[PDB]
């Protein structure tokens, strides 16, 4: 049901497998030769044989980064949903808290009253005939 | 491991199973006859024997209400602690949110620089000799 405790737990648990693939591809990008991102390095290629391999390297870095940016974008959208979920839920919990407090004060009233009948009954139990005699 | 997603999941699950015993003891208290809580009913007792049966009844209503109020006061302290956890956690999540936003924006920056190298490379390759005669 929404937006209940189980909902929140499931959404909380899908943050675990939001890491996973993270730091590895993150290290592939973390590296990446400087030649694939600095255009000013291009003047140093004086060989078509070398220039064509930078071309292929560059191509696949382009694919790595595009895919990763897609995953990151999705994770951020998920985090915003999880945020709204948390906020709605803490907001509901404050209500539940207020009502439970009231219920408890109602049961303390009931306990007081029962306690009162108890005390006065101890008095009232004498003052009556023990008709066995 | 505090505090921390794992922490919150555990505290979250210990909320479902605090309502377990609820509705039955809650229902026994609900049906507590008026004779054990109204001191004004005591004068309708004109027989020591009926007053003593009442005395016993009253007594066990007293234990039912005291133990239930103890569990309830405890539940309320746990909910207040969960409140504090939920709130600390939504703040740390807003932090993580901002850092992930900046991180991604930096990876889109890197994507653009790579993109620029791709184009200038497509131009710069026909500027070199295909040595083959």
């Amino acid at each position: 049901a929404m937006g209940s405790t189980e909902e929140l737990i499931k959404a909380l648990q899908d943050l675990e497998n939001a890491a996973s693939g993270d730091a590895t591809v993150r290290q592939k990008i973390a590296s990446l030769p400087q030649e694939v991102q600095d255009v000013s390095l291009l003047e140093k290629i004086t060989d078509k044989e070398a220039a064509e391999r930078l071309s292929k390297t560059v191509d696949e870095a382009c694919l790595l980064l595009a895919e990763y940016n897609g995953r990151l974008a999705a994770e951020l959208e998920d985090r915003r949903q999880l945020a709204r979920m948390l906020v709605e839920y803490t907001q509901n919990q404050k209500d539940v808290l207020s009502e439970k407090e009231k219920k408890l004060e109602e049961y303390k009233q009931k306990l007081a009253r029962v306690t009162q009948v108890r005390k006065e009954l101890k008095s009232h139990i004498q003052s009556l005939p023990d008709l066995s005699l």
Side-chain angles (χ1 to χ4, degrees), chain A:
Chain A
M2 78 229 185
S4 56
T5 288
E6 176 195 54
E7 203 198 31
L8 187 60
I9 290 200
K10 298 299 283 193
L12 242 36
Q13 272 147 8
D14 304 340
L15 212 55
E16 303 286 300
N17 204 338
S20 186
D22 221 7
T24 169
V25 161
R26 167 184 198 81
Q27 184 68 43
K28 283 219 52 209
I29 294 167
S31 73
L32 251 44
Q34 196 74 30
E35 46 178 25
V36 182
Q37 70 199 94
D38 203 334
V39 206
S40 280
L41 269 54
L42 276 195
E43 284 185 323
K44 302 172 180 72
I45 333 194
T46 56
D47 172 29
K48 208 196 180 87
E49 190 167 334
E52 251 161 16
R53 263 173 193 136
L54 179 57
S55 164
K56 51 137 300 171
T57 291
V58 173
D59 265 12
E60 66 203 6
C62 191
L63 258 115
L64 162 67
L65 270 162
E67 292 173 334
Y68 187 81
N69 289 23
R71 275 160 252 172
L72 269 239
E75 183 190 324
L76 262 64
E77 180 59 23
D78 287 357
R79 294 191 106 87
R80 286 181 271 256
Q81 265 134 240
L82 184 267
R84 270 174 295 175
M85 195 172 309
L86 260 38
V87 150
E88 256 143 24
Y89 187 97
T90 86
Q91 205 66 22
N92 275 43
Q93 280 289 121
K94 290 177 177 168
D95 282 351
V96 166
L97 193 274
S98 137
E99 296 160 27
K100 294 250 172 182
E101 288 180 325
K102 312 310 156 193
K103 213 64 195 179
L104 163 69
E105 206 71 13
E106 162 186 334
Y107 285 94
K108 292 204 296 148
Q109 258 247 347
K110 192 169 274 233
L111 173 68
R113 293 178 192 293
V114 164
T115 268
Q116 188 199 30
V117 166
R118 194 211 214 203
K119 284 189 179 71
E120 284 181 26
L121 217 227
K122 206 203 219 295
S123 130
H124 183 93
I125 267 188
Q126 294 90 13
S127 321
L128 281 158
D130 185 328
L131 295 160
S132 332
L133 333 136

